[PDB]
Amino acid sequence: PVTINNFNYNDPIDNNNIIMMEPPFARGTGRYYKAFKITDRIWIIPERYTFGYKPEDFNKSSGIFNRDVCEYYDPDYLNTNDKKNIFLQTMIKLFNRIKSKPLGEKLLEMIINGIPYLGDRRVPLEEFNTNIASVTVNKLISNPGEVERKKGIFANLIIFGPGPVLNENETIDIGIQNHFASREGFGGIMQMKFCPEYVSVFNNVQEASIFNRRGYFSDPALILMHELIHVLHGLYGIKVDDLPIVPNEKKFFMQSTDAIQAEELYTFGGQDPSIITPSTDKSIYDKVLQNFRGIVDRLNKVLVCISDPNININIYKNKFKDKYKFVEDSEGKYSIDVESFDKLYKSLMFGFTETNIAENYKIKTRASYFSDSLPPVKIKNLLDNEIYTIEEGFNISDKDMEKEYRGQNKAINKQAYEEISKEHLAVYKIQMCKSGICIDVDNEDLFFIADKNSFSDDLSKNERIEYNTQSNYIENDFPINELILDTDLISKIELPSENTESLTDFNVDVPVYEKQPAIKKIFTDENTIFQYLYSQTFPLDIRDISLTSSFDDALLFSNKVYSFFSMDYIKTANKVVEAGLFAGWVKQIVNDFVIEANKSNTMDKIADISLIVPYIGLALNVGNETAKGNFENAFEIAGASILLEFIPELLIPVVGAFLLESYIDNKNKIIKTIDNALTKRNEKWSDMYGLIVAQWLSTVNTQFYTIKEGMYKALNYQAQALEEIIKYRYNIYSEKEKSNINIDFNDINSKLNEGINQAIDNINNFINGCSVSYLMKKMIPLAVEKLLDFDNTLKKNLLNYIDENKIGSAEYEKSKVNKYLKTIMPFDLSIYTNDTILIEMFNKYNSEILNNIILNLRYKDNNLIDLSGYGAKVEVYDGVELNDKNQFKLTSSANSKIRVTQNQNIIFNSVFLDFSVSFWIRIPKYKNDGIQNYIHNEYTIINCMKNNSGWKISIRGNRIIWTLIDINGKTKSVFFEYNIREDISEYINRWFFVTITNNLNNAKIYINGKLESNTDIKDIREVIANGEIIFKLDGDIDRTQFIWMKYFSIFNTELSQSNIEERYKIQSYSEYLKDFWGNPLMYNKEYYMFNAGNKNSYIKLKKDSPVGEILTRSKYNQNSKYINYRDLYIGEKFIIRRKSNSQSINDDIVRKEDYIYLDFFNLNQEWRVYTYKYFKKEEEKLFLAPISDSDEFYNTIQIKEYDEQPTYSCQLLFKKDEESTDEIGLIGIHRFYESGIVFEEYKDYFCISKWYLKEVKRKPYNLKLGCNWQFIPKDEGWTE
Ligand SMILES: CC(=O)N[C@H]1[C@H]([C@H](O)[C@H](O)CO)O[C@@](O[C@H]2[C@@H](O)[C@@H](CO)O[C@H](O[C@H]3[C@H](O)[C@@H](O)[C@@H](O)O[C@@H]3CO)[C@@H]2O)(C(=O)O)C[C@@H]1O
Ligand SMILES: [Zn+2]
């Protein structure tokens, strides 16, 4: 296997495993460096990397080299032999840790055996050349001086110490004459600057961090394996260059940084390889395959070596052959074997990745290449087995530090590292100035957004299709379990000897590095995320602060700090009290904090949004000036797009035309030139999707990431300000007082910190949801548009080609070109990534029924708009009446209609027909004098057709019908018909909930949650349902006909009885009571009274007494056999009067638990409903009389709602007053016995009783109770 050699810096040079090397970039001059062979082909040179850096660049200065690194400097690292030795023994411990597992061992075995080819592009094909700076390095044998005797050796890797920045490790490849052999299939001597003690830190949980350090530090063994992978790539010459991801740097808020090549993202692995589109994934693949082709060609022509005649040609042809896995026939002719080439390429690109390795060694690491990095820490002593071991790293089981990566946790394993002198770090910043007053922001914190230039246009080219053309897919994945099982991977071919002729051609390009201003001053007067966060901090030389809800004073005054929490919270926080009241005050301001932070779990179900964090806007004011107005509302309208700081310009090209041309003649076999044109279409879809996912991850999800982060900081700064205030108020008191104040600062932070954690969890689900939403509604659809377009153009491309050829199949193989293109590829994120976090975001998004809404009509600023997020066009004509209660009216006028142009690029169409339509509706009563036309005339109210196919909602009298029409013209229906011979109906002219669902076998109609009708729709063919939707009364309707609708919406999936019952309860909910028809109950409005327990009964002021008698309602008197009902406009006319408010009398809405006066009219006076305060019985006739203030009667009533289920009924409770919990009883109707000298009978009266009090508490709620009322005002939908 792999042998890790041992030695000490002070060991003597022997010119074998301890030498005096003359590094490549030395150009063969300057001086020599003592090097050690830690394993075959691998050397360690324990000295600073100085090639290309000015000796001064090692000190901390006004500059920085890299823009995204908190750079630590220290020129004294490795300035002694004892340090050089420690560096050595540390490197040794690391390689041992690397080989401690099969996986890292295979890495090393691959790096040792992957010897650089002999020569590069310049070397003739038939030759070998060891005399080039990328193949040979020189060792010195002289003693008193240089030059005297120089020997040459081969090497695969030289690891130096760090350059100017300790924590900026980097693998470097050799360039000669503007070219890189490590990028052309040859490979070449690799170099590296590595530092083991100064590791990077990445953000993550560590306690709950509202006081104790947060984050985890890296295992230097993974940091070295990350670098070795670059080495591997270099050695095999596949570290090719291609179209990089480049940051957009046009806006002041965008992160400036170097371009990022695929090789770096492939090395990290995880989700990062998804940012490299499938088009580029293939570009690279092809360039590497092309390189190997050249190498396999050389092996077939190589004969002599004109550099070291000592070189054995056969020995080398057998090594390279095994390196590259070429196949050698029985004659010796070398050739590329696609399968082996494949597994090898994937192994080097997707097998050995920092993600797969960390998982294997059980080491924690950063989630993505694009993730905020914290400042570095110094590991105290990697040479101490109590702190770090070969087998386990920092996560040692004996110290119970294996679980949860505790060994790398900063808040837990503080004996393992040291914080570093910030007075030694350098950070590239952007000083954001106005116009006086500027703010420094670390480039790290800005938004990273991939410019459009970052993505390939290869999708717009053409494709010659032939019987040969096959599919091309590079799965950015490789099963690491088999890679750990030796068969192919590791080479058992002898490794040639490292000694050879000396290097004499020291030609080579040596990179020069220079620093650049660390601070970059830019100008802008905007106050977005960065400013709002700054507004929440304060200087260290200030201990006395006060909160303000005003962003501007906060910026102006140093002792003023901005808070996005409530006005109430802010007032209490700035409170100042007596020591005797400090405890209490602390207890509540912290609880307040907790309650405010938890407002991040706010629901908004009525607007079809399950999760919403109302304060995100005030907190960051990110995107579309979100700190102004009501955040919840604005989100409800534009959605996740208002949170984005920048709306990116996507790259969605026209998929290049096809050509099946190049293939004629009457060959009935090459026919597959079409069969391959189809599967190639599927490749074009997939690739387009991958193109999208790639832009989403680097232009959209990156921005959301910055928001989740900004919220973490925002919430933290908040707790910090609060703790600062608390501490100040406490220390104002004398020691005598403090001693008696019961305060536990550890419980304060604990509680403050717990709240933040609960919030972050909410803020996270919220933001991920948006990100996915923006993916699915503002990105995927646009991609579908072009694919459905390419489809068409491709449909005419084909067919016509089945025409230009011959032949029976020509017909049965033309249908094949139909049934295929009639199937669009469903987007599935799991196809382009395997990152668990992402997959979970996506699965969570597809499991929320609400995300299935493709149309949701809502009133907003006197117009109806689609809020689904798919941007349906909504044209609302003049004949339509709208109110802010979301009710719209459709009349008989030709201009009373709504036209909706559905989004044509959404999924909805597929074999089965799966979607739902939900809405509320009020259908006016029939005119008694036209019952004939009513029951005979059927009229459409919502029509959605295309090519004579689609769905339709119509009404014929008392019946509502759902109708389906497939392309062939076949029709099926289903309907709900409400009886019109009921004394009192629950549907006629009353608002009710309709829901229609369709699966592959049934069309079901639900009314108010319950299922009323079913219908088999198997026979039904395809039903085109994405045509224009026309809302309008169309048919032979009466001039007086009208309809009221509300909350109209569509789901592209069948809703379940559960989802329906829930939608019903959600939309039914209101803070107010309702009247008989289902509309808001109102003050100062005439109403007749209905009793839910005595349907056919009404109240009337008895002639000779202050009581309301109860009479039988009169009914429909005409001679119709089709109708029958009870009059509703009968009995006394009541009018609910507000109890409080002494400032005039308008006409507001009646809310639950409201105090009212139940009055009514008698002739030209307004009387009232009273109760005798002293009845000793359980029930008593109510006392009805003129308005007055008598101390013997209760006049104040409380309107309540005991039912927990949807109902238009309500109850009237009599209480002592507005506080006592003393209930007098409920208003209802009672039956009494009467015996006088002439009449003996029973009669019911307007009663009040205690008996109802306990009855209303039972479950399920008794809707039949006599204490249940409903108010009926006149209504055009009901004439009698
Ligand atoms: C409408 C009706 O007749 N049904 C209920 C009536 C009615 O709701 C109220 O009278 C008017 O709102 O009430 C019933 O009795 C309860 C109560 O209302 C009165 C009855 O006058 O007292 C009842 O308790 C006692 C009752 O007075 C005595 O005659 C004797 O029977 O003992 C009972 C219990 O100790 C009771 O609280 C009614 O039956 O009259 C209940 C009806 O469902
Ligand atoms: Zn890297």
Side-chain angles (χ1 to χ4, degrees), residues 1017-1020 1022-1135:
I1017 56 177
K1018 305 186 182 188
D1019 167 20
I1020 288 292
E1022 171 183 53
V1023 179
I1024 304 177
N1026 58 278
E1028 231 170 52
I1029 292 179
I1030 304 298
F1031 290 75
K1032 173 185 181 297
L1033 311 196
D1034 171 54
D1036 212 59
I1037 56 167
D1038 187 300
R1039 295 197 289 293
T1040 46
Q1041 197 66 68
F1042 67 82
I1043 283 285
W1044 280 99
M1045 266 201 254
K1046 181 180 186 180
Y1047 291 159
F1048 186 83
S1049 44
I1050 302 173
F1051 304 70
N1052 49 30
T1053 183
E1054 166 183 50
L1055 291 190
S1056 63
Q1057 186 292 316
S1058 177
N1059 299 334
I1060 301 183
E1061 172 62 64
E1062 205 178 311
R1063 200 163 181 66
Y1064 178 61
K1065 294 184 188 166
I1066 291 175
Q1067 299 183 316
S1068 296
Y1069 186 84
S1070 60
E1071 298 284 280
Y1072 51 67
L1073 295 144
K1074 307 187 183 187
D1075 62 34
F1076 190 90
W1077 308 118
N1079 291 312
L1081 190 61
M1082 303 286 279
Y1083 281 97
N1084 322 320
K1085 187 176 175 178
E1086 315 187 312
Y1087 291 124
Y1088 293 82
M1089 285 187 85
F1090 177 75
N1091 186 285
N1094 308 63
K1095 291 188 174 183
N1096 303 341
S1097 301
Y1098 62 91
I1099 314 164
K1100 209 265 186 182
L1101 179 55
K1102 190 186 184 193
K1103 184 186 173 186
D1104 62 53
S1105 45
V1107 307
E1109 57 192 314
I1110 307 308
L1111 315 184
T1112 305
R1113 288 172 181 285
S1114 22
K1115 54 184 176 179
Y1116 172 64
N1117 302 309
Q1118 300 149 52
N1119 68 310
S1120 180
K1121 72 175 185 184
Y1122 299 100
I1123 56 187
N1124 169 279
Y1125 63 78
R1126 288 288 162 148
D1127 292 331
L1128 309 182
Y1129 303 146
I1130 187 160
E1132 303 298 309
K1133 313 185 302 163
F1134 300 80
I1135 195 173

Side-chain angles (χ1 to χ4, degrees), residues 37 40 167 240 366 401 562 608 640 707 766 777 914 959 974 988 999 1154 1232 1236:
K37 188 191 299 175
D40 301 311
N167 58 319
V240 309
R366 53 203 292 183
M401 305 251 252
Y562 179 65
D608 292 319
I707 295 173
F766 179 59
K777 311 181 187 314
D914 190 39
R959 173 188 293 183
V974 63
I988 301 162
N999 46 35
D1154 269 3
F1232 296 66

Side-chain angles (χ1 to χ4, degrees), residues 1178-1179 1229-1231 1247 1249 1251-1252:
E1178 196 86 290
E1179 37 53 53
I1229 297 181
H1230 180 46
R1231 183 175 191 273
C1247 280
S1249 172
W1251 187 78
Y1252 293 128

Side-chain angles (χ1 to χ4, degrees), residues 3 112 127 170 256 275 492 524 548 573 781 927 930 969 999 1010 1228 1237 1258 1263:
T3 296
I112 292 179
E127 310 200 315
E170 162 176 45
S256 287
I275 293 186
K492 41 203 190 69
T524 175
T548 179
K927 294 290 184 180
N999 46 35
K1010 181 167 177 291
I1237 57 174
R1258 296 168 58 177
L1263 316 159

Side-chain angles (χ1 to χ4, degrees), residues 59-73:
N59 292 301
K60 177 198 179 180
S61 81
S62 70
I64 45 75
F65 286 92
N66 197 273
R67 293 172 283 181
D68 323 293
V69 193
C70 306
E71 312 183 332
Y72 176 79
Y73 290 72

Side-chain angles (χ1 to χ4, degrees), residues 584-598:
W585 175 80
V586 172
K587 171 193 178 182
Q588 79 188 66
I589 186 60
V590 173
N591 190 63
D592 274 21
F593 190 91
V594 174
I595 299 180
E596 294 288 299
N598 281 310

